[PDB]
Curated annotation (Swiss-Prot), chain A:
Domain of life, per lineage: Eukaryota
Description of how the protein assembles with itself and partners: Interacts with SCF (SKP1-CUL1-F-box protein) E3 ubiquitin ligase complex. Interacts with CNOT4 (via RING domain). Interacts with E3 ubiquitin-protein ligases CBLC, PJA1 and PJA2. Interacts with PDZRN3. Interacts with PPP1R11. Interacts with E3 ubiquitin-protein ligase PHF7; the interaction inhibits cleavage of PHF7 and promotes association of the complex with the nucleosome core particle.
Described function: Accepts ubiquitin from the E1 complex and catalyzes its covalent attachment to other proteins. Catalyzes 'Lys-48'-linked polyubiquitination. Mediates the selective degradation of short-lived and abnormal proteins. Functions in the E6/E6-AP-induced ubiquitination of p53/TP53. Mediates ubiquitination of PEX5 and SQSTM1 and autoubiquitination of STUB1 and TRAF6.
Pfam families: UQ_con (PF00179)
InterPro entries with a match to the protein in the record: UBQ-conjugat_E2_core, UBQ-conjugating_AS, UBQ-conjugating_enzyme/RWD
GO molecular function: ATP binding; ubiquitin conjugating enzyme activity; ubiquitin protein ligase activity; ubiquitin-protein transferase activity
Record-level GO BP terms: protein autoubiquitination; protein K48-linked ubiquitination; protein modification process; protein polyubiquitination; protein ubiquitination; ubiquitin-dependent protein catabolic process
Active site residues per record: 86
Protein name per its UniProtKB record: Ubiquitin-conjugating enzyme E2 D2
Family: Belongs to the ubiquitin-conjugating enzyme family.
EC number annotated for this UniProt entry: 2.3.2.23, 2.3.2.24
Impact upon substituting residue 91 to A: Abolishes histone H3 ubiquitination and decreases interaction with PHF7
Species for this entry: Homo sapiens
From Swiss-Prot, chain B:
Subcellular location(s) per record: Cytoplasm; Nucleus; Mitochondrion outer membrane
Membrane topology reported for the UniProt record: Peripheral membrane protein
Effect listed in the UniProt record for changing residue 65 to D: Phosphomimetic mutant that binds and activates PRKN
Upper classification of the organism: Eukaryota, Metazoa, Chordata, Craniata, Vertebrata
Cross-link (Glycyl lysine isopeptide (Lys-Gly) (interchain with G-Cter in ubiquitin)): 6, 11, 27, 29, 33, 48, 63
Residues marked Interacts with activating enzyme (site): 54, 72
First-to-last residue of the parent protein present: 1 to 76 of 229
Modified residues (ADP-ribosylglycine): 76
Organism, as annotated: Homo sapiens (Human)
UniProt-recorded name of the protein: Ubiquitin
UniProtKB/Swiss-Prot annotation, chain C:
Domain of life from the UniProt record: Eukaryota
Domain remark from Swiss-Prot or TrEMBL: The RING-type zinc finger mediates the E3 ubiquitin-protein ligase activity and binds directly to free ubiquitin. Non-covalent ubiquitin-binding stabilizes the ubiquitin-conjugating enzyme E2 (donor ubiquitin) in the 'closed' conformation and stimulates ubiquitin transfer.
Residue range from the parent sequence: 257 to 342 of 346
Oligomeric form and interacting partners: Monomer; binding to the ubiquitin-conjugating enzyme E2 does not trigger homodimerization.
Protein's cellular compartments: Nucleus
Outcome recorded upon mutating residue 36 to A: Reduced binding to free ubiquitin
Protein name: E3 ubiquitin-protein ligase ARK2C
Positions of region (Ubiquitin binding): 10-12, 36-40
Mutation effect (residue 62 to A): Reduced ubiquitin discharge
Family indicated by similarity: Belongs to the Arkadia family.
RING-type zinc finger span: 21-62
Function: E3 ubiquitin-protein ligase that acts as a regulator of motor axon elongation. Required for efficient motor axon extension in the dorsal forelimb by enhancing the transcriptional responses of the SMAD1/SMAD5/SMAD8 effectors, which are activated downstream of BMP. Acts by mediating ubiquitination and degradation of SMAD inhibitors such as SMAD6, SMAD7, SKI and SNON isoform of SKIL.
Organism (species): Homo sapiens (Human)
Residue sites binding Zn(2+) per the record: 21, 24, 44, 47
Amino acid sequence: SMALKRIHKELNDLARDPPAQSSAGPVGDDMFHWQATIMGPNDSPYQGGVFFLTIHFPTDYPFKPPKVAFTTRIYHPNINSNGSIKLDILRSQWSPALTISKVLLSISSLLSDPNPDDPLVPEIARIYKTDREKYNRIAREWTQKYAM
Amino acid sequence: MQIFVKTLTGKTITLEVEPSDTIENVKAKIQDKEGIPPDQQRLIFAGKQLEDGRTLSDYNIQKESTLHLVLRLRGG
Amino acid sequence: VQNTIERFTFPHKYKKTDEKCTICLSMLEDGEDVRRLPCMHLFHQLCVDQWLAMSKKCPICRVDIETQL
Ligand SMILES: [Zn+2]
Ligand SMILES: [Zn+2]
């Protein structure tokens, strides 16, 4: 209810000032469920891809973080095959001053600069560390299959 | 050679090591001095986490270097 | 607890450049119950007090409300 007012405010912000490189809006008539797209950033092995996100807002948002998950497959140490994201501002580092806009920037920044030391899928992190160009090649390959 | 290990509190210890010593050897040297098990030790130098099978020279840790010691968690 | 908050922050009624509460996203207006943190950041009493019940950090800079140096 207060969460609804604040979700409405954010949407107005997206209206008045449309972000570059991302899109998000409600799913149907449900303001507590959103959908979004991220561009793969140009530095990454995901350049050229667009990744799809599903977003749920809890009833006491913004005091508790939204649930965010990829619905596009991606080769990434912190994003597993369910689309779950290991990102600090999404659990312990969440703040009621953060917005969905900044969450997307972060996820995008997470794509450009992975955190292999606290990985969600161990095997990818080991390849990321041991063999970078192995990692970037298969990331690019997954980008071509799932993200085009 | 001489190096220092530092914790989040500022607490500083000093080790004698060799450039060919491995991160496992270094962690074992920290166990001796501080009673912390190698399994609980996470070493970080110049932003990078140090891996158990590599040596100090592999990261070009040189004389009077400071490593950082934190808790190795399960993750992730 | 609530009076840990009162001992380390400044509640007051707003006198009005615009300023926005980063929690609710609405502008502060004359007479509203607001509160300032040792970081100098300002929110609506209701907005920030809800977070301070869960955390002793500033939503913006994240500095602890009991920081001193
Ligand atoms: Zn407010
Ligand atoms: Zn602050």
